[PDB]
Design a protein around this ligand. Sequence first.
Ligand SMILES: C[C@H]1CCCN(Cc2cc3c(c(C(F)(F)F)c2)CN(c2cccc([C@]4(c5nncn5C)C[C@@H](C)C4)c2)C3=O)C1
Ligand code: NA
Ligand SMILES: [Zn+2]
Ligand SMILES: [Zn+2]
Length: 384
Amino acid sequence: KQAAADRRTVEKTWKLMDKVVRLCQNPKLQLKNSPPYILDILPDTYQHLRLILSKYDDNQKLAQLSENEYFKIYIDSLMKKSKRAIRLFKEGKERMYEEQSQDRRNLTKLSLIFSHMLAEIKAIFPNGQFQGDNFRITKADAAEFWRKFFGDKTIVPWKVFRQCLHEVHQISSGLEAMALKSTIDLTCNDYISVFEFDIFTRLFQPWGSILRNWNFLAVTHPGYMAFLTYDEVKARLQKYSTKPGSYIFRLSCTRLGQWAIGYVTGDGNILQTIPHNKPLFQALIDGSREGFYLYPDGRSYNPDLTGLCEKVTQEQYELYCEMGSTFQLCKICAENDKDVKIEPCGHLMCTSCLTAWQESDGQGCPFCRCEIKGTEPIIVDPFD
Ligand SMILES: C[C@H]1CCCN(Cc2cc3c(c(C(F)(F)F)c2)CN(c2cccc([C@]4(c5nncn5C)C[C@@H](C)C4)c2)C3=O)C1
Ligand code: NA
Ligand SMILES: [Zn+2]
Ligand SMILES: [Zn+2]
């Protein structure tokens, strides 16, 4: 239940965003030349919110804008993530100037979220005018699923989304649904917009086997590198510059919904290819056959991807989730946040999962089997 997105509220986010920009202007961090460039994303976010206000330039237009379900979620999320970034500098202290630290890692995670939020608002409010109820989902079979379950909604809670997705593509576990959430919920706000749904369905098409494509291509494929800048792709492949056909595929925060395959050419150079509006597995199959994509991440074994033309372990889902921000999500249901701690073992879960466990098995903690001497409500930050 977020507050109305009135002018007063919108401006509170600008002041919080200016605070993040000031903290990030410190030369000790060296963030001026540090992607995704938070010192560029936050001013651009300001200019977009300003462009939107110019389009809703009267009291009646401001009343419609402040009631817009997507806009309220956006401003509330922008507010939350900005406060989170200020809190990161407050508690990180000198560990913010060390590039390998977890505090710096969390700032890169926040910088990626602000990048995704900016691309989202520009897609939903092109030219500052709301067009979410007329957003074009690139895949028709994915568009039909969205229209079927959510009508003309532009954004829906993750918990409603997951359940409706399960009705068409079965999700096998709590860890799989958590890995899935960190993949689709790019803005890390516990909601899925039609834009985030379009990116996910473009990346892992065809829709008919989208969870098999995602499990193979992203959860277990050695060639998958998640978000990388081109300099990082080159740095990764430089080790294998002596092995033509070495390759990796990555996401690009400036080309959402598309893949970029970086590869070692016969003459030692590192080049990249952006596949067309076709499945990534077909581009990898064609490239393997043609001698360009042979060794994923320089490794001799290239997985057989032909099965996708016509089994992931719980540990693999756990490693996959580490990169994202899902530590606050209940591992059992993957739909509610952790809000209770079991005493004395310290394991965490949501209130309703603990009540369900207590009425079903209840013979110790559902994770370690230790006797439940007590419970204590808690608030979990994604970076705890
Ligand atoms: C663009 C450049 C900027 C400098 C850091 N490098 C490396 C880097 C990549 C990711 C991250 C970091 C860091 F913040 F943890 F530090 C760092 C985080 N990160 C990230 C954050 C949330 C979700 C994901 C996805 C993912 N891929 N494998 C597992 N997961 C959960 C890709 C989404 C569709 C789901 C990835 C990177 O890609 C990326
Ligand atoms: Na989201
Ligand atoms: Zn739960
Ligand atoms: Zn326990």
